[PDB]
Amino acid sequence: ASPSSELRRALEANEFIPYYQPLSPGQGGRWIGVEVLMRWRHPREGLIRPDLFIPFAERSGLIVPMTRALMRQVAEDLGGHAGKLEPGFHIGFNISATHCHELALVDDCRELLAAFPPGHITLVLELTERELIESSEVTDRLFDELHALGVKIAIDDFGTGHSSLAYLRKFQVDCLKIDQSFVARIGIDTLSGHILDSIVELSAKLDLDIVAEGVETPEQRDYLAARGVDYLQGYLIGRPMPLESLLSSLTVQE
Ligand SMILES: Nc1nc2c(ncn2[C@@H]2O[C@H](COP(=O)(O)O)[C@@H](O)[C@H]2O)c(=O)[nH]1
Ligand SMILES: [Mn+2]
Ligand code: NA
C-alpha cells in the first residue's frame, strides 16, 4: 500500500468528519462553545482518532485540504441551527503550522463565518504551544487580517511548550488553553499547583481568557473555578460527540 494515496482516497470519499467537544463556563451553566476535532470514519477499522493519522497527513501535505473540508462540513452541520446557539457561541479548530503561512486561511475563515448570521458565533483558531510558529511578513499580514475578521487566537496545550510574553503580543493571542496533564495533577503533586497558578497568574497579567482542558472530576472543576478559570473542557463536561448528540443536548439547554 501507500499511506499518502490512502489519505487522498479518504479525503475524496469524505471520510474525515467533525466531532464536537463542548466548553462550559468555569462557574457552570449552558455550553458556550465547541472545539471541533477530526475523526476518520474508516470503511474497515471504524472511527479512528487523529493521533493515528494527522502526523502522516502533515508529512504528506494533506492536512490543509483536510482542515478546509472540516471547516466546510461544520458550516453545513451547524449553519442552519444558529437559533440553538446562544450568541457569541465559540467554534474552535486546531490549525496546523503550515496553514499559518498561507493567506488562504483568511478565506477559509471568511467562508465559515458567512454560514452563520453576523456576529452570531466567534471563530477560534488553536495553535499548539509545542510548535511555536516562526514569524514573517506573511504571518504578520495573516494574523492582522484574521483579527479584523473577528477571529480569535488561542494557544493550545499551554504550559507544555516554551513561548514568551513577546510572542503572545505578536500573534494577538486572545486565549490560553491549559494542557490536560497539568489538570490531571490537581490534588496530587504540589509542583503543578505552582505551574497551574503561574499560568493563571500570566493570564490575569496579560488580560487573556483561559480554558482548562481535561477536566474529568468535580475536584478538578472546583479547584479551577476557585482560581478564576473562564472555561472548562473535558470528559466531565462532555466527551467529543457526533453532531446528532451535540444537537440533542443543545435542544435540551434550549
Ligand atoms: N483523557 C482525556 N482526554 C480528553 C479529555 N478531554 C479531551 N480529551 C482529548 O484530548 C484531546 C484534545 O487535546 P488538544 O487540547 O490538544 O486539542 C482530544 O483527543 C480529546 O478527545 C479528558 O477529560 N480526558
Ligand atoms: Mn485543541
Ligand atoms: Na492540540
Would you say the C-alpha torsion 113, 118, 121, 126 has a positive or negative sign? positive
30: phi > 0 → left, psi -120 to 50 → alpha, else beta; which?
beta
Mind giving me the DSSP string for the chain?
--HHHHHHHHHHTT-EEEEEEEEEETT--S--EEEEEEEEEETTTEEE-GGGTHHHHHHTT-HHHHHHHHHHHHHHHHTT-GGGSPTTEEEEEE--TGGGG-THHHHHHHHHHHTS-TTSEEEEEEEESSSPPPP-HHHHHHHHHHHHHT-EEEEEEETSS---HHHHHHTT--EEEE-HHHHHTTTT-SHHHHHHHHHHHHHHHTT-EEEE----SHHHHHHHHTTT--EE-STTT---B-HHHHHHHHHHH-
The CA distance from 26 to 226, in Å, is 9
Instruction: Ligand 1, residue 179: give the atom nearest the CA.
Output: 15
Question: By residue range, what is the domain housing residue 9?
Answer: 1-254
Ligand 1 atom 7: residue of nearest CA = 234
Query: CA-CA distance, 127 to 96, in Å (whole number)?
Result: 7
CA distance 126 to 75: 18
Closest ligand 1 atom to residue 35 Cα is: 17
CA–CA gap between residue 32 and residue 53 (Å, rounded): 29
Which grid cell is 115?
Answer: 454560514
Task: Find the 115 Cα to ligand 3 centroid distance in Å.
Answer: 25
Ligand 1 neighbours by CB, cut-off 6 Å: 21, 37, 94, 156-157, 177, 180, 213-214, 216, 234-235, 240
The three-state (H, E, C) secondary structure of 27-41, written as one string: CCCCCCEEEEEEEEE
Q: What is the resolution of this structure in A?
A: 2.2
Q: Which residues surround ligand 2, an ion (CB under 5 A)?
A: 94, 126, 156
Best CA proximity match to 121, nearest among 151, 146, 96, 145? 151
Protein residue whose Cα sits closest to atom 20 of ligand 1:
240
> Which three cell numbers, joined as nine digits, stand for 210?
483561559
Amino acid at 37: L
Nearest 10 degrees: Cα torsion 155, 178, 96, 56 = 160
Task: Identify the CA nearest to 66 among candidates 54, 49, 78.
Answer: 54
Q: Which atom of ligand 1 is nearest to the CA of 128?
A: 16
| Domain count across the chain | 1
Structure determination method: X-ray
Beta carbons within 8 Å of 223's beta carbon, 6+ residues apart? 186, 187
Pocket test for ligand 1, best of 213, 217, 224 (most atoms within 8 A of CB): 213
- Separation of alpha carbons 229 and 23, rounded Å: 12
* CATH label of the domain that carries residue 152: 3.20.20.450
